[PDB]
Design an enzyme around this catalytic site. Structure first.
Site, PDB file in Angstrom:
ATOM      1  N   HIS A  61      27.161  68.876  31.380  1.00  0.00           N
ATOM      2  CA  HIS A  61      28.386  68.416  32.066  1.00  0.00           C
ATOM      3  C   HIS A  61      29.213  67.463  31.217  1.00  0.00           C
ATOM      4  CE1 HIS A  61      25.203  69.327  35.066  1.00  0.00           C
ATOM      5  NE2 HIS A  61      26.172  70.110  35.496  1.00  0.00           N
ATOM      6  N   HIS A  91      29.415  57.714  28.982  1.00  0.00           N
ATOM      7  CA  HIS A  91      29.828  59.097  28.809  1.00  0.00           C
ATOM      8  C   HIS A  91      31.325  59.133  29.011  1.00  0.00           C
ATOM      9  CE1 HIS A  91      29.359  58.591  33.107  1.00  0.00           C
ATOM     10  NE2 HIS A  91      30.408  59.400  33.206  1.00  0.00           N
ATOM     11  N   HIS A  93      34.815  61.757  30.344  1.00  0.00           N
ATOM     12  CA  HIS A  93      35.458  62.955  30.954  1.00  0.00           C
ATOM     13  C   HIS A  93      36.724  63.254  30.207  1.00  0.00           C
ATOM     14  CE1 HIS A  93      32.935  62.411  34.658  1.00  0.00           C
ATOM     15  NE2 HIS A  93      32.918  61.152  34.218  1.00  0.00           N
ATOM     16  N   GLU A 103      39.919  60.871  35.032  1.00  0.00           N
ATOM     17  CA  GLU A 103      39.591  61.027  36.490  1.00  0.00           C
ATOM     18  C   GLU A 103      40.418  60.068  37.304  1.00  0.00           C
ATOM     19  OE1 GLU A 103      35.175  60.928  36.436  1.00  0.00           O
ATOM     20  OE2 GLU A 103      35.484  63.096  36.786  1.00  0.00           O
ATOM     21  N   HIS A 116      33.276  56.065  30.753  1.00  0.00           N
ATOM     22  CA  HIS A 116      32.546  55.416  31.865  1.00  0.00           C
ATOM     23  C   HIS A 116      31.303  54.791  31.295  1.00  0.00           C
ATOM     24  CE1 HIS A 116      34.435  58.318  35.015  1.00  0.00           C
ATOM     25  NE2 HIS A 116      35.236  57.331  34.622  1.00  0.00           N
ATOM     26  N   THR A 195      31.392  60.188  40.074  1.00  0.00           N
ATOM     27  CA  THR A 195      32.402  61.256  40.212  1.00  0.00           C
ATOM     28  C   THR A 195      31.822  62.647  39.921  1.00  0.00           C
ATOM     29  OG1 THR A 195      32.904  61.079  37.885  1.00  0.00           O
ATOM     30  CG2 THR A 195      34.094  59.626  39.389  1.00  0.00           C
TER      31      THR A 195
HETATM   32  O1  HQT Z   1      30.047  61.022  35.682  1.00  0.00           O
HETATM   33  N1  HQT Z   1      29.005  60.253  35.989  1.00  0.00           N
HETATM   34  C1  HQT Z   1      27.680  60.712  35.729  1.00  0.00           C
HETATM   35  C2  HQT Z   1      26.634  59.947  36.048  1.00  0.00           C
HETATM   36  C3  HQT Z   1      26.835  58.711  36.617  1.00  0.00           C
HETATM   37  C4  HQT Z   1      25.746  57.911  36.945  1.00  0.00           C
HETATM   38  C5  HQT Z   1      25.951  56.649  37.535  1.00  0.00           C
HETATM   39  C6  HQT Z   1      27.279  56.189  37.795  1.00  0.00           C
HETATM   40  C7  HQT Z   1      28.337  56.958  37.458  1.00  0.00           C
HETATM   41  C8  HQT Z   1      28.125  58.261  36.861  1.00  0.00           C
HETATM   42  C9  HQT Z   1      29.200  59.046  36.530  1.00  0.00           C
HETATM   43  S1  HQT Z   1      30.832  58.474  36.831  1.00  0.00           S
HETATM   44 ZN    ZN Z   2      31.720  59.607  34.794  1.00  0.00          ZN
END
Ligand code: HQT
Ligand code: ZN
Length: 257
Positions: A61, A91, A93, A103, A116, A195
């Site tokens: 993803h 990570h 997006h 986002e 993020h 998200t």
């Molecule tokens: O996109 N994403 C993926 C995993 C995750 C885990 C904890 C908090 C936020 C996330 C997000 S935004």
């Molecule tokens: Zn994220």
């Protein structure tokens, strides 16, 4: 299973994850005119001097840069937060085109990508217990626009070719996430969610007003990643963003006049 395509994208997620239509989902549009300055907010404290990165993973993803969160090392506190949150991973997006990818949006404006940095409230002991709590997580969100390169991003861009496909990981030690931060820590904050599935409503979102600039070549390299595993038809990892969700009964507060 879930993803970002026509048949398994954001408009489908509610069937496996009904909280997709919950009361505090993310992202949202940040209406700058409606977000009120809150002079009781404290400055944000980002203490990343001892951060210890371990590994980078293509999860099908996005890619995650993971940190050793076994000690108290890389923490976010202050701002809207009570107590101390520990960095566990970051990570991004991003879009197939520079005109989309973030986002959150700012007065409906989409940036090319969004970083993020995920942190968990250390009062709950670890990440898994933190995602069972409404104040378990804090995510620092940072917009990317395409312009000048971000030197502090290059070590991540250069490793992507080693994790092209789903399930691949690589050693990724000694990466310093301070190099991904803009000058100002002015931010907007609101209560929201992951998200991505499982869309849990645990997150205090802290979205910086100042974007970082990355180069066209840097984001092009993100778009060469794949959602598929090795040996599967290639599907480029692009447009792994969820669109803005209803604000519902929430207020977005600004840390700055
Ligand atoms: O996109 N994403 C993926 C995993 C995750 C885990 C904890 C908090 C936020 C996330 C997000 S935004
Ligand atoms: Zn994220």
């Amino acid at each position: 299973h879930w993803g970002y395509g026509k048949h398994n994208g954001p408009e489908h997620w509610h069937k496996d994850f009904p909280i997709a239509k919950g009361e505090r989902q993310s992202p949202v549009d940040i209406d700058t005119h409606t977000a009120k300055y809150d002079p009781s907010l404290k400055p944000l404290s980002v203490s990343y001097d001892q951060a210890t990165s371990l590994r980078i993973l293509n999860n099908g993803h996005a890619f995650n840069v993971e940190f050793d969160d076994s000690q108290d090392k890389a923490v976010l506190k202050g701002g809207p937060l009570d107590g101390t949150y520990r960095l566990i991973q970051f990570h991004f997006h991003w879009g197939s085109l520079d005109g989309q990818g973030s986002e959150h949006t700012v007065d409906k404006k989409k940036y090319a990508a969004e970083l993020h940095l995920v942190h968990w409230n250390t009062k709950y002991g670890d990440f898994g217990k933190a995602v069972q709590q409404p104040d378990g997580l804090a995510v620092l969100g940072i917009f990317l626009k395409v312009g000048s390169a971000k030197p502090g991003l290059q070590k991540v861009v250069d490793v992507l070719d080693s994790i092209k496909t789903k399930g691949k990981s690589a050693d990724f030690t000694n990466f310093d996430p301070r190099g991904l931060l803009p000058e100002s820590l002015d931010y907007w904050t609101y209560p929201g969610s992951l998200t991505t599935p499982p869309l849990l409503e645990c997150v205090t979102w802290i979205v910086l007003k100042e974007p970082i600039s990355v180069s066209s070549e840097q984001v092009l390299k993100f778009r060469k990643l794949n959602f598929n595993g090795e040996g599967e038809p290639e599907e480029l990892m692009v447009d792994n963003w969820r669109p803005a969700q209803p604000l519902k009964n929430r207020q977005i507060k600004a840390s700055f006049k």
